[PDB]
Structure formats: C-alpha cells, structure tokens
Design a protein around this ligand. Structure first.
Ligand SMILES: Cc1nn(-c2nc3ccccc3[nH]2)c(O)c1[C@@H]1OC(=O)c2ccccc21
Ligand SMILES: [Zn+2]
Length: 357
DNA sequence: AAATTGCCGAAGACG
DNA sequence: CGTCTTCGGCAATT
C-alpha cells in the first residue's frame, strides 16, 4: 500500500534528464556571470542542496536548490537577541580595500543590501537568456532565495541562495546540536563540525517587520552529507550492504504535508523543513539500521507520524543543529495552525490516508 | 588557471 | 532479486 504510493512519488529518469539539462545550463551561466570582474561576488562557488540533490524529492523534478557560497574571511558574529539562528555580521579589521565595502552599514554587513545586488545581477543576466524560457520570481520577504521560474515547458523553480562561508568554529548555540553520537558517531560529528558554516540572508522577523541586516545559519551542506551517509552501518544502502527505508519515510511524510498544504491555506506556515527536522530526531531516537528495515516501512512511518503529532501537540520541534530554536513556537506558528494540522493528520492516519489519491 | 576529464555511488529501468 | 544506465560530485589534470 505504502509501496504503491512510493512508486507514484518516484521520479522518472526521462523527466530527471529533461529538467537537469535545462537547470544546469541556466545555473552555470549565472555562476560564470557572478565570476565576472567588477562583481562583488567574484569568488562564489556552487554547492547543490535540497530535496533533489539528497534524492528525497518526490512526484516531479520541478524544484532545485543551489547555494552560491562566498568565502568571507575574518568575520565577528553577534547573536541577534537569543534566537540562536539569526546574526548580525561585522568584520574584524577593515580589509583595506573591500569588495563588500558597498554593502556595509557602519560596521554591519547588511544582508538586504548584499542580497539586493545579488538579485539585481541575476535579474540582468536572466534577461539575456534567449534559448530558454526563464524569469525571476517576485521578491518575497523572509526568503534568502532569488528564485527562477523555468518553463521547460514543464514548470521548474530554481532557488539560488547566496551564502557566506566562514571557516571558524561553529557559533556556540550549535554546541549541543547535531546529537548524532549514538548513531553516526563522534568521529563523524567532530569531522562535520570542522567544516565551514554558512549564513544566508534570511532576515529575522522582529515583529511585523524584518531586521534587514540579519543573516541566518544554514546547515544545508551538513544535512546533505547525512542524507547520503545515514546509517549506523557504513554499508547502509550501498551495493554490498542492506537497503533501509529511512528516505522512503521522509518521502511519505513530505507527501502527506504537501498534499495537505495544497488544499488548506491554514497550513501555509508549515513546510518541508519541519518534516525533515522531525525525521532527523527520529533517526537519532532510533539509530539502528534494523529498526528501518524496508519490511518495517509501515510502522516506521506511523512512528514518525506519532512523533510529529507529539511535536505539534506540545508546540515544540527543536531545530536539529540549534536546540534553543523552536520551529513550532507560538511566535512562528500560531497554536490554532498547529491544532489544525494535528486533526488533519490524525484523520488521514485513522482512515488509511485517502489524501494519497 | 578556468575548464576538461576520469571515477564511481545513488538510484531509475527492466526482466 | 541483477544488470545496465544517467546524473551528480570530486579533484587531478592540462
Ligand atoms: C519555516 C522554515 N524555516 N526554515 C528554516 N528555519 C531555519 C532556521 C535555522 C536554520 C535553517 C532554517 N530553515 C525554513 O527553511 C523554512 C521553510 O523554508 C522556507 O524557505 C520557507 C518559506 C516559507 C515557509 C517556510 C519555509
Ligand atoms: Zn540506508
């Protein structure tokens, strides 16, 4: 039953090929545009992130995330209040002549300025694209992404995400995050935390407005590693190892949410990342590959449903990397919203998930 | 040195 | 289930 739904969600190779060919042409052209002289973003490098590059994208290959990461040396971070995720950015000594001089605000590096110039450079390059149907989606507050809309003639979106790369140690609000010691282990955890961290220009929402200079922590690179290296046994899902159903559970939960979101706008505040975060905790909670045997698919899905409902009910979903940050706090999602999503989930759970059709 | 090339894991396709 | 395939990611190389 759940296998038959997975078959439907599975992407088709001809679709992948058609989408990939077009997406790669467009992105590689922006990247090189960004590589150009006079640009502030001259040293940006590409990093592919998100559902598609983690092999957890469902239904159609119609959404692509790409991080244009910029190695910015020597930055001091100041925690924006006690959020743990959001930050103001200063430089240690002024870099003499600085490519990012123009994005400054006294001593603070404005995310809004830097994104706006990034967006402007992308918009100008996209207008020059003639062989392909592409446009830049209207800017949306609360988004670090400059979003492309491609008609291939299939509708494809590409989120291009400016990121600052910092090679220093991770900010202390992450110090008790990534609790993978009993699962992927301490060598993996330590090694992952020796990798750079990223800031993306998603602004903290003060109240009714955004704080235009703030940045947000991104662990999209770390998450991608984990999705590809997700078992306690090194050979999980390898050619001389056992297949598990961890990713299949993520896809089923992703689908259940996306179906509910399509017809209920009371659910607009929720999104895939809530689901991904929840399954990260599941994987931590049940680290043994044996617990995610494909034959146990139904009960792993139901256990994930159960955990998620409990997160809704208690209004608490800890960010996996930043445990202070509650993705289900009253302040980000109203109680009523969470209670709405609960009853719909419970209903689909006690009725054999009719919405899967 | 920006771009090509070589390698192979992840996973779709098919019997 | 096995085998074949395309895509993605890496970094050595020219
Ligand atoms: C609600 C949400 N949070 N979120 C998110 N919060 C983070 C905090 C710290 C680090 C990464 C985060 N990603 C995140 O990626 C989303 C969804 O991704 C979005 O771009 C988005 C947009 C509208 C609603 C929900 C989301
Ligand atoms: Zn596995």
């Amino acid at each position: 039953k759940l296998k038959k739904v997975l078959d439907k969600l599975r992407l088709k190779r001809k679709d992948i090929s058609e989408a990939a060919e077009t997406v790669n042409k467009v992105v590689e052209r922006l990247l090189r545009r960004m590589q150009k002289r006079e640009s502030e973003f001259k040293g940006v490098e590409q990093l592919n992130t998100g559902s598609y590059y983690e092999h957890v994208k469902i239904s159609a290959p119609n959404e692509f995330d790409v991080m244009f990461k910029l190695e910015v040396p020597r930055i001091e971070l100041q925690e924006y209040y006690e959020t743990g995720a959001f930050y103001l950015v200063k430089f240690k000594r002024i870099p003499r002549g600085n490519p990012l001089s123009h994005f400054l605000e006294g001593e603070v590096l404005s995310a809004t300025k830097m994104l706006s110039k990034f967006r402007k450079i992308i918009k100008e390059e996209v207008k020059e694209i003639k062989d392909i149907d592409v446009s830049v989606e209207k800017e949306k507050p609360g988004s670090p992404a400059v979003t492309l809309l491609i008609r291939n003639p299939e509708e494809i979106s590409v989120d291009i995400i400016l990121a600052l790369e910092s090679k220093g140690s991770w900010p202390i609000s992450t110090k008790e995050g990534l609790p993978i010691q009993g699962w992927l282990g301490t060598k993996v955890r330590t090694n992952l935390r020796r990798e750079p961290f990223y800031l993306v220009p998603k602004n903290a929402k003060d109240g009714n407005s955004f704080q235009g200079e703030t940045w947000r922590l991104s662990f999209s690179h770390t998450e991608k590693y984990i999705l590809n290296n997700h078992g306690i046994e090194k050979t999980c899902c390898e050619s001389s190892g056992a297949k598990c159903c961890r990713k299949e559970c993520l896809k089923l939960m992703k689908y259940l949410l996306e179906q509910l979101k399509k017809e209920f706008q009371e659910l607009d505040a929720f999104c895939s990342y809530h689901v991904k975060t929840a399954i990260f905790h599941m994987w931590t909670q049940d680290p043994q590959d044996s617990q995610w045997d494909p034959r146990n698919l139904s009960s792993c899905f139901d256990k994930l449903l159960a955990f998620f409902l409990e997160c809704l009910r208690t209004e608490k979903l800890d960010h996996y990397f930043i445990p202070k940050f509650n993705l289900f706090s009253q302040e980000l999602i109203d109680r009523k919203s969470k209670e709405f999503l609960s009853k719909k989930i419970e209903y689909e759970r006690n009725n054999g998930f009719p919405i899967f059709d």
